[PDB]
Amino acid sequence: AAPGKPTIAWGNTKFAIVEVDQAATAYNNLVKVKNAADVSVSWNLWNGDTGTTAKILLNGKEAWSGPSTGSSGTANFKVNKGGRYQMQVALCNADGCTASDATEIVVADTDGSHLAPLKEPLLEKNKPYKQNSGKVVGSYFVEWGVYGRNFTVDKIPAQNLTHLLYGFIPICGGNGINDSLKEIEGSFQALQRSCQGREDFKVSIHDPFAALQKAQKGVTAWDDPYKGNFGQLMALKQAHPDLKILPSIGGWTLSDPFFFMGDKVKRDRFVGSVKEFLQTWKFFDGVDIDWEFPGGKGANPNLGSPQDGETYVLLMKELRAMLDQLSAETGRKYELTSAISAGKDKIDKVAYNVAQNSMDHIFLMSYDFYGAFDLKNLGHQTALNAPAWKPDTAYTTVNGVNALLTQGVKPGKIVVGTAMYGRGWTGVNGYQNNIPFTGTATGPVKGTWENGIVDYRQIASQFMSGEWQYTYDATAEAPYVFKPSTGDLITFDDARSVQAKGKYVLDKQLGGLFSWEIDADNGDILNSMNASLGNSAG
Numbered sequence: 120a121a122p123g124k125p126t127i128a129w130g131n132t133k134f135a136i137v138e139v140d141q142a143a144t145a146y147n148n149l150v151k152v153k154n155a156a157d158v159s160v161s162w163n164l165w166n167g168d169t170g171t172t173a174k175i176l177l178n179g180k181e182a183w184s185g186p187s188t189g190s191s192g193t194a195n196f197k198v199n200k201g202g203r204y205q206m207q208v209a210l211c212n213a214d215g216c217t218a219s220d221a222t223e224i225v226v227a228d229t230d231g232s233h234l235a236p237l238k239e240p241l242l243e244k245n246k247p248y249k250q251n252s253g254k255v256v257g258s259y260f261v262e263w264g265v266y267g268r269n270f271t272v273d274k275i276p277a278q279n280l281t282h283l284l285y286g287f288i289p290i291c292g293g294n295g296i297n298d299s300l301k302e303i304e305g306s307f308q309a310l311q312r313s314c315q316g317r318e319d320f321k322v323s324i325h326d327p328f329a330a331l332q333k334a335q336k337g338v339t340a341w342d343d344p345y346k347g348n349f350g351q352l353m354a355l356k357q358a359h360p361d362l363k364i365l366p367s368i369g370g371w372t373l374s375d376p377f378f379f380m381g382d383k384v385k386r387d388r389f390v391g392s393v394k395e396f397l398q399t400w401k402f403f404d405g406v407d408i409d410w411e412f413p414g415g416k417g418a419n420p421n422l423g424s425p426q427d428g429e430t431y432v433l434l435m436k437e438l439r440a441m442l443d444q445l446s447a448e449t450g451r452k453y454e455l456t457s458a459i460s461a462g463k464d465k466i467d468k469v470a471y472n473v474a475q476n477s478m479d480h481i482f483l484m485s486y487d488f489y490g491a492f493d494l495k496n497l498g499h500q501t502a503l504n505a506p507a508w509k510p511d512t513a514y515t516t517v518n519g520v521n522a523l524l525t526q527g528v529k530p531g532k533i534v535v536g537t538a539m540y541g542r543g544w545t546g547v548n549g550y551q552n553n554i555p556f557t558g559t560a561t562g563p564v565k566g567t568w569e570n571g572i573v574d575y576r577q578i579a580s581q582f583m584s585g586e587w588q589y590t591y592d593a594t595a596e597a598p599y600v601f602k603p604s605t606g607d608l609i610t611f612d613d614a615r616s617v618q619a620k621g622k623y624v625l626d627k628q629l630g631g632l633f634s635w636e637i638d639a640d641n642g643d644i645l646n647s648m649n650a651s652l653g654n655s656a657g
């Protein structure tokens with residue numbers, strides 16, 4: 120005498136608590152945060168009594184009920200928790216309940232709770248390591264790498280990292296605020312489009328297609344609410360719940376807005392937009408501030424002020440206070456980090472001994488010491504120590520670490536930078552004693568993607584055979600290759616120089632190692648980062 124068993128009607132099964140508008144280019148229209156997903160289910164009864172009550176069950180728990188008044192019905196209700204649910208329709212009367220077969224529905228949320236884990240095999244030369252050293256092992260993944268570089272989130276050797284940094288999250292602003300972007304074709308216009316209707320000095324997403332909509336492994340179904348980099352990072356967090364995924368704000372071309380944050384009106388708006396961003400995108404674990412640089416001498420020759428050091432310290436303090444409030448609301452731990460210049464000249468513009476009290480980690484950019492931006496003075500771009508031919512070299516890793524320690528920075532805060540790329544010159548000439556670095560160049564070396572820069576993958580693949588000389592400088596702890604016929608000279612990190620940096624980190628009780636940029640490694644560099652810090656293989 121119980122009701123007939125209903126049949127769930129064919130229809131959409133994927134819903135979203137944070138909805139992405141699929142026909143919008145402005146961040147304010149693209150992202151719609153709701154308190155709950157609007158879910159809809161219909162059913163038909165092809166045999167029997169329709170009962171007197173109809174219920175929608177999610178994993179057995181009623182989400183909706185109403186009178187059963189005909190052979191077909193529809194239910195609209197709200198679901199406030201993300202996940203994949205076994206949904207049933209049940210028809211009930213005084214003599215019993217009859218539940219349909221289950222249909223899986225998706226209620227998407229930005230922690231990835233609706234997503235299958237993105238657990239992918241290691242590629243190229245990457246070998247498995249356990250994160251049991253207690254040291255930082257970090258790397259940058261770049262938003263634009265999914266195009267020409269064809270390097271997507273499913274290719275990250277995520278088990279071999281403690282920290283994954285996402286470069287880069289922009290700060291809204293047009294003329295005079297993001298002028299450095301005008302040097303990249305279409306890039307300034309892209310940010311203005313993303314920021315339409317949005318206040319200057321709030322964060323946004325620079326390339327929303329790459330971030331949210333490009334089909335990628337695990338998020339290829341047209342009705343998947345989140346695709347692109349963010350969708351995959353949510354699924355990666357499901358596979359690696361202890362991985363720290365941090366949005367990096369700034370970098371070389373997106374740092375101009377920081378120079379205006381001495382105005383607390385702008386600084387407050389920025390910090391508040393970061394809080395909203397983390398509440399919106401729950402898979403991120405904090406924020407990384409990559410201001411290049413307090414005091415100027417970044418991409419924009421017209422920016423930089425003596426107040427920048429005070430602004431930096433105030434910004435870190437206020438970001439920390441915001442993250443502590445967010446941590447209290449969610450129960451989660453959030454991290455505040457910053458990538459900083461390793462040059463003593465720039466380090467002494469900031470009181471890092473004060474700012475460290477707000478920060479979890481300082482990512483010391485101990486690379487780019489030399490490069491094709493200077494054709495007259497050549498040197499190791501990421502070396503640990505000075506070379507034998509110039510022991511007074513200003514830009515070395517040790518000089519940057521020592522400058523921080525001299526201010527009073529605790530060694531455990533300091534994460535040493537390694538390069539997964541080389542910088543190089545062409546036409547090097549006029550050098551002495553077989554040391555090409557004592558000469559001068561006529562231009563940049565032919566690069567993988569841009570002049571003067573070469574992926575480590577390509578260095579190991581193409582430039583360690585043939586006419587290329589190879590030398591490991593054991594005084595500086597730095598490899599380099601040189602082709603004398605053309606004068607091509609590339610300075611980079613290899614497994615052995617990374618080994619020296621890791622041993623140095625352990626010896627000086629520093630925080631760990633990090634790298635730029637993950638797509639450029641073939642595995643050798645990250646392998647050595649893990650091994651040198653004492654992570655066990657496996």
Ligand SMILES: Cc1cccn2c(=O)c3cc4c(=O)n(Cc5cccnc5)cnc4nc3nc12
Binds near residue numbers: 306409
């Ligand atoms: C190709 C491209 C397209 C669009 C935007 N792009 C950027 O915004 C970039 C920024 C940086 C940058 O900031 N650095 C310094 C650095 C090192 C370590 C940590 N943080 C910062 C180095 N290379 C970069 N390449 C960039 N390329 C692009």
